[PDB]
Amino acid sequence: PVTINNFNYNDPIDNNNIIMMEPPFARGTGRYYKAFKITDRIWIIPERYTFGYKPEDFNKSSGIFNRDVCEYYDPDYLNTNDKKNIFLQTMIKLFNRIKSKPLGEKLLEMIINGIPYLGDRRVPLEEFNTNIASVTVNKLISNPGEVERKKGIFANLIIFGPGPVLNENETIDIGIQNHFASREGFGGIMQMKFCPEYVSVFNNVQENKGASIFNRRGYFSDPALILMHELIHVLHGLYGIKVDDLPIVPNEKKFFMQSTDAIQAEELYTFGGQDPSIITPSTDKSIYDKVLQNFRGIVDRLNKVLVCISDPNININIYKNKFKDKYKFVEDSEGKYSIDVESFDKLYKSLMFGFTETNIAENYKIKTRASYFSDSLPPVKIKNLLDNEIYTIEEGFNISDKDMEKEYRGQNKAINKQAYEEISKEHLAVYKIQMCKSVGICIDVDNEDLFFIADKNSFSDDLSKNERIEYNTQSNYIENDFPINELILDTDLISKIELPSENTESLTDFNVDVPVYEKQPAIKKIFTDENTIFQYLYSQTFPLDIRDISLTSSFDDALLFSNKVYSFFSMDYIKTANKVVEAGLFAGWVKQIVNDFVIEANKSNTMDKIADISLIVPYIGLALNVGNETAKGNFENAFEIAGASILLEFIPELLIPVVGAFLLESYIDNKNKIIKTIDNALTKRNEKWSDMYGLIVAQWLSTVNTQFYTIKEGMYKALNYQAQALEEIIKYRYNIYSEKEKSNINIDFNDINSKLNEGINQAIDNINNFINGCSVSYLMKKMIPLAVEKLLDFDNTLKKNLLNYIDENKLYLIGSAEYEKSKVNKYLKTIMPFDLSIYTNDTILIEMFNKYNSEILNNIILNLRYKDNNLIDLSGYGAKVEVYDGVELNDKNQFKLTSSANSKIRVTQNQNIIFNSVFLDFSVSFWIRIPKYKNDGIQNYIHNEYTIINCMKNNSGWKISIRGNRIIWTLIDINGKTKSVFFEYNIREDISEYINRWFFVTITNNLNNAKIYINGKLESNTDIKDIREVIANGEIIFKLDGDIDRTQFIWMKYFSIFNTELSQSNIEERYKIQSYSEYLKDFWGNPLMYNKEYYMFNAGNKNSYIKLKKDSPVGEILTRSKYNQNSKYINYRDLYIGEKFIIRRKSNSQSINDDIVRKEDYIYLDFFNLNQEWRVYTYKYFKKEEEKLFLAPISDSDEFYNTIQIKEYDEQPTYSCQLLFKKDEESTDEIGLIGIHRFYESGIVFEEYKDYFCISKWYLKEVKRKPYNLKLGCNWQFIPKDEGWTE
Ligand SMILES: [Ca+2]
Ligand SMILES: [Ca+2]
Ligand SMILES: [Zn+2]
């Protein structure tokens, strides 16, 4: 158990637990400090830390010590005894809060027992030397009047009050002759500058801190966690493992980059959480090795130590025993000390990954920042930590009895205001970057708001070095984690060995290196005329001395006029916001513009499913103009084209080393070692893959995700500014009225602000998801594949290497040299799948990942789309696409393959996308229109199979071919074994849904089946378990190839590939998404047009058509003629028959050229009678359920309705549409729908039934039934002449 001593600042000196100490950095001169022993080996000195600081530095000046801290100054802190005593009592409570839990008590116990080795690098191995400034510190025994008697003592930790900057807590170790004992295994006296009342403030952007913009957002820190954070550094320092290694260093070549001090891996380990992942596994191991090496040096000293000259009273055994336990060395029955790998490993992990701020915060239920790389904010002052009404040893601020326990409400700035006070900005110092334009207006930006981007130098190149594979060689992995529960329950973790006496001989060699600090300018100017994020956000603010503003979509005016504020919301929203109204209409207006705000903010949930993009926040580009001029042009389009990478302010130069070559150890005649060797090189190869991935994740987190975090923050600020601006306008407008008018104006600013705030929170969530999705997208498509390339390159080089090896030893491999020849190939075969959770256990990151991977659209490895008269791949994987001259394309994303040699498309697929699941698992989807066979060429049509899409590599692959009325899918495994599945549509039907008609195809493949889907429905299946490997990433060729007729062609649209098997659900869903359009379709499936001749088809009367009756102004219904010629293979009904209709537009007399017919349009339905154009009418006064339509010349009789509204009642994809007659555009009185009705006719000679072109009210209720009755006689389709259909 740990004992926390008690005392008052005025208690008298006793030279034991209360002394006059001579601090290490005083170099043995200067005055002493009243020091209090709070526990063994730990001292508290309630005075300001002055070593290395000028006295005036304690005042706020025009400078700053650290560029990334809102520094608070106060030279009066601790300038009295009562203050010093308060400081003491406060420290006592914090230490008490700390040991209040097992985890904290152990940290304290580990620290107390982690006494520094007696000596350092300069000391001889056979000796213990206490006479160095990292081991002994002196205390003055003498009477106040002389330094006559000084005594030396051993100490582990000395804690002072803060230096010039109150909120800049720090742990310092002792350097002597340019070396640090605490960094080389010995350990040494640790010091700390600490301030308990002025704690840091932080807030999680992805989360809602009270979810109120008009209120204080954020959380303040539990000073006990802050202290435990520093105590972790102390623990590292004491055990001598606070080693230096390759640091994370920020790139600063660009003005938008954040400037900050280099960050050592130890710093990130201390914080824990995601941060350790920024330290590559490479460096992780480098550090592990350095520490191990340091321990080897100590264990060797223990086996050599003989005497201690410095203190003749030191008991060598007592210390050898203590140090043995400290470092967990093992001693044989003979007394020989040696390093035990298990014990070391566990001890190392415990100190670097067990004791972390993250793990501790979690155990003590204390809330803290998300990552070391989180924007710092202005600190707040806790009112009184000594008041149990506000802060307790057991719960800190989150006191349950006060209901401040849930959701860390006790640390919530908006909820626990009685706990703290805001700080006088007048005393805060903040490093700023002043961006001036070469002219000239200037903008100040906090160095915090810039983009932190790790320079390439931050990462290890170790992967590029050679490796020696020997029968004994083994893998190397360091899990950046540690089971906190076992750490807490570890029985032998805490020493049970006697702590030696702290009294020793006085220190006489005061040699030590003292740091010297100095401020630097708090403002750094830079010149740039760039109008990126910083400017855009700026243009959205206004001066405090200005209260009358106006919104404007002009970024340039906003900058030029203080009364002008930029808004990235809609033109309409902007106009309404600047409107001015009568007091009596003000309330209406307030409700209107506020609701409008929420609408605009909510556009953050926009979907773009047709472009295979689920979520997109359209206004991000206008709001920040971040990355590549994202404020110009249409953002959504730009995004569809280049994706996530267009949002980045800078594209990072990744470090992807060529994996060092392997060197295997040969063992002549030894059939065992030779094999081991081989096996090992294999395993090692896998370690190389993992290490490479970690290297990637590390760079992604510190150069990419960091930028995206900056963007999410920028959006939060942008949205906040918009609300503030609107609020400003509202207040201004309202205050223009008289008190009398105001009294009668019903307005509740609390509901307004609540409305805004809510709309913002919704938008923030959408924005956060969109951005995380982008980040993960960039990782997986722009980073990972490049690592895969070099990793596969490595594999190959290793492949021959291994073979050539087995080769040379085949002798000593005799009758087994074979069983391993394959063993090698079959290993370097199946590669390693990337798994984020392997390099981190951060909940947020893991979830981002799983979310991404659970979105089918991300399984798209090829998506050919039309753009600026050209087909490009928008999968994001960069496939190269060559579209040759003979290929015709349109902006309808339709492309045509002809019989010409140059009607061809070549796709060079990305070779670095994992596509070899090792069982075949992928899908292909596309729309197609296959022309009808030539009646005189039917034999060749059914006989000649021709390839349309071929993807082969080494006589293995897949292909789509066609033989007449049959489309075929074929696979060839590496052995030449083939399998196919096909879909054949019937060519003997009166009317076909497929011939010359656009239809959706989808082919799925999995270890067991090959399935063909047509329009969302499954049509064919083939068992493919037999098929072996199938190379599928070879070149893809789109071209007709086979004995085809010269007139043969094929139309294709939306060709795409997924590296997985699509479910019936996904397929049905893709069918619907791609079928959608505002416009109606024609019989063939192309968009319906105005001023285009069409024959009419009836879905309810397939073999019926319309003809003008000879003696009557009506349309009679005749039976379609059918295929005349003979042949046992074909049969169909003629389509180019009946009257030739033409759809005419209604409003806008902008001539009658042409255009697209959209659902709900009003039209005239005409047809050609000889040289004239007639029209279809309805007698307004028919009284029966149905009426025969009136067909006559164009005129405007008041007895006939002539206006028709085209409709779509079917909610599922269809080429049918319906025609409605309504009183007039306005009226909601539906006269009826156009269809066909049966009539009984009995003349003097003939007696029969005869169908007519009618209008009918019966259809009105029928079209509402579900499912939609496709057979309804009111379902029509328009057939225009098409080269794909001849009769
Ligand atoms: Ca790591
Ligand atoms: Ca302005
Ligand atoms: Zn730290």
From Swiss-Prot:
Zn(2+) binds at H229, H233, E267. Residues 854-1075 are annotated as: N-terminus of receptor binding domain (N-RBD). Binds 1 zinc ion per subunit, to the LC. Its EC number is 3.4.24.69. Residues 440-853 are annotated as: Translocation domain (TD). One of its GO terms (cellular component) is host cell cytoplasmic vesicle. Its cofactor is Zn(2+). The active site is at E230. This is Botulinum neurotoxin type B. It comes from Clostridium botulinum.
